[PDB]
Amino acid sequence: CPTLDDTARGAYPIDSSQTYRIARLCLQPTTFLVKENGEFVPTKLVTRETTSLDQIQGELKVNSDGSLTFVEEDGIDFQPVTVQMAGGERIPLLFTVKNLVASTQPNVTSITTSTDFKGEFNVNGTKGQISLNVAKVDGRTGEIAGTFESEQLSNGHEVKIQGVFYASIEPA
């Protein structure tokens, strides 16, 4: 995924008289864990091609409490990934956030390094939860970066996916 400029700094103010969108959200997994004996255990990524989900986008709606809700409306729908257990079993997964609806804390006056988005997604047989932890904001450009954690049930397994993300926020 893209990265922020090395001098990126500040907060990204949110004008309550305007409406906003996520123009691009890219999720780059760094870890796939699969439940075995009740424990999420690490697996090795086998897929050599890109595993990132990119181009995710949609409105950021305002709720009655000043929180923002991101509604995914377009983007790459899924990425097929294969991971390998320690003992050699290869497991195909579809990494996705299709139909994501995710909200921030109340009283959004600016996107900062303490902003979080939490929500759920669901597509076909997968039901999932994800948290986006913003870690860096470029207030000039609307670019943000952070880490994410998702949990879902893809292909008969319970899977946790974690990684880094990049996003760009802008007025409608």
Q: Which of 152, 151, 150, 148 is nearest to 164 (CA)?
A: 148
DSSP sequence for 106-149: SS-SEE-TT-EEEEEEEETTEEEEEEEEEEEEETTTTEEEEEEE
- Shortest distance, position 135 Cβ to Ca ion, whole Å: 5
User: For residues 122 and 133, which CB has a smaller minimum distance to Ca ion in the complex?
Assistant: 133
Residues that bind Ca ion (CB under 5 A): 113, 133
Residue 29 Cβ vs Ca ion, minimum distance, rounded to whole Å: 19
Of 68 and 159, nearer to Ca ion (C-beta) is: 68
CB-nearer residue toward Ca ion: 32 or 165: 165
- Are 63 and 105 in contact by the 8 Å Cβ rule? The answer is no
Sign of CA dihedral 45, 128, 74, 3: negative
The residue count for the chain: 172
| Shortest distance, position 144 Cβ to Ca ion, whole Å | 10
CB 119 within 8 A of CB 128: no
Q: For Ca ion, which residue has the nearest CB?
A: 133
Q: Which residue, 133 or 141, has its beta carbon nearer to Ca ion?
A: 133
We find the least distance from the C-beta atom of residue 146 to Ca ion, in angstroms, to be 6
